[PDB]
């Protein structure tokens, strides 16, 4: 089978900037090459066919070139709505084969997270479970750390974390951290704290509640 290799695997680009990504095939594919786009959370869409033919509805700023084994896609004047994963597909020989994808993320000014902690609902407590949730919203860059303390004591297990993709409007990231305990363990302690460490501050953002208030 024909191997399609895309480079780079990942990248960051400034708004307005000219971005180029490449696809290399293991053998000549006679320009029977297409580029696809997948915006975060959304379906695959074809942008280019036969190497340099733009699909109708696709903006002028996107353009494909190359021949033989070596192909590229170029965005001029990158826009917010261009973030996502780009893939290169050869339709020259069976089996048709795809590249592994290049992820394009937007570079932007740093942002501190807006942290919220939420106690368990009484509905959930009625069932014997207790989840404490913390949102760390709209921060940049993506790297961040969250720490839970229960009556001051750091908790590692019982915690599940999840990150969004870059928001398509403000290019920020968000993450949620959820501590799930039994009702019984939850009610054995007073203080629940979520602490967010981000490069934007030397000191972490601490949010807290007490069961006895």
């Amino acid at each position: 089978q024909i191997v399609m290799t895309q480079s780079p695997f990942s990248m960051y680009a400034t708004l307005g900037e000219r971005v180029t990504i490449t696809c290399k095939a293991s053998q000549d594919i006679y320009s029977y090459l297409s580029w696809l786009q997948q915006k975060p959370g959304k379906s695959l869409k074809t942008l280019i066919y036969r190497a340099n033919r733009l699909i109708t509805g696709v903006p002028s700023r996107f353009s494909g070139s190359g021949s033989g084994q070596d192909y590229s896609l170029t965005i001029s004047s990158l826009e917010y709505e261009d973030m996502g994963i780009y893939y290169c597909l050869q339709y020259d020989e069976f089996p048709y084969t795809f590249g592994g994808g290049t992820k394009l993320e937007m570079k932007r000014a740093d942002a501190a997270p807006t942290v919220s902690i939420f106690p368990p609902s009484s509905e959930q407590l009625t069932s014997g479970g207790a989840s404490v949730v913390c949102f760390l919203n709209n921060f940049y860059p993506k790297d961040i750390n969250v720490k839970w303390k229960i009556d001051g004591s750091e908790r590692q297990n019982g915690v599940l974390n999840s990150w969004t993709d870059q928001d398509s409007k403000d290019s920020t990231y968000s993450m949620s951290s959820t501590l799930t305990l039994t009702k019984d363990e939850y009610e054995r302690h007073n203080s629940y704290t979520c602490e967010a460490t981000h490069k934007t501050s030397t000191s972490p953002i601490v949010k807290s509640f007490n069961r006895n208030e």
Binding site: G101, Q124, S174, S176
Partner: protein, 222 residues
């Protein structure tokens, strides 16, 4: 001109057959083109599975040779995928599409919307939906942030909206996490302090595999 729509079950057991249908409108599948199935695995890798041409001729990825069959019903303008003896590695988002059979004139590949199929032995289960309201000792800001915890469902997906889609900005939904054959996610919305609780805020949760829709009003803690 042409439209393509995948349909079929969202959950299949290991060792059973996975079946999907593509319904084509605006173009007849007997005139020209090749009618294709591809899939995207979790982790984003993509694979071409095969096609049936406008002539009825099939081409199959050699990686799938024993297990796959692509057929068609020309009176309904549909084509079909069957993948036998599935395992959990067949969990993927399945797309139908149209490609050019002949090199000239030059045709552009065109894909459907995709449909997720999970291969698992676990039981379909609807979510429990819980409100996320701030502790009553918490501080009012300019903006308040609320949410919904959608817990203990299977399989994916779930969609969550707020006030039936009227609240769009200041909204985001976190990817689900899988524990013990059950998924959990939450969703966050941020609106002005002046507008909640005077204006009511409701998360709408839809879980298609269980045919379930739940709406939960977020009420202040006292």
């Amino acid at each position: 001109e042409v439209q393509l729509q995948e349909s079929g079950p969202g959950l299949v057991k290991p060792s059973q057959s996975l079946s999907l249908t593509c319904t084509v409108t605006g173009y007849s599948i007997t005139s020209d083109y090749a009618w294709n199935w591809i899939r995207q695995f979790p982790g984003n890798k993509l694979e071409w599975m095969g096609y049936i041409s406008y002539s009825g001729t099939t081409s199959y990825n050699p990686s799938l040779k024993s297990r796959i069959s692509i057929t068609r019903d020309t009176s309904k303008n549909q084509f079909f995928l069957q993948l036998n003896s599935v395992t959990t590695e067949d969990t993927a988002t399945y797309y139908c599409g149209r490609t050019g059979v002949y090199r000239y004139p030059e045709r552009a590949p065109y894909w459907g919307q995709g449909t997720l199929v999970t291969v698992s032995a676990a039981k379909t289960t609807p979510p429990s939906v819980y409100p996320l309201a701030p502790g009553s000792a918490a501080q009012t800001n300019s903006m308040v942030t609320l949410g919904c915890l959608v817990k203990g469902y299977f399989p994916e997906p779930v969609t969550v909206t707020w006030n039936s889609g009227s609240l769009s900005s200041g909204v985001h939904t976190f990817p689900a996490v899988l524990q013990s054959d059950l998924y959990t996610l939450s969703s966050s919305v941020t609106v002005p302090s002046s507008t909640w609780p005077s204006e009511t805020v409701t998360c709408n949760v839809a879980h298609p595999a269980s045919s379930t829709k739940v709406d939960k009003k977020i009420v202040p803690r006292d």
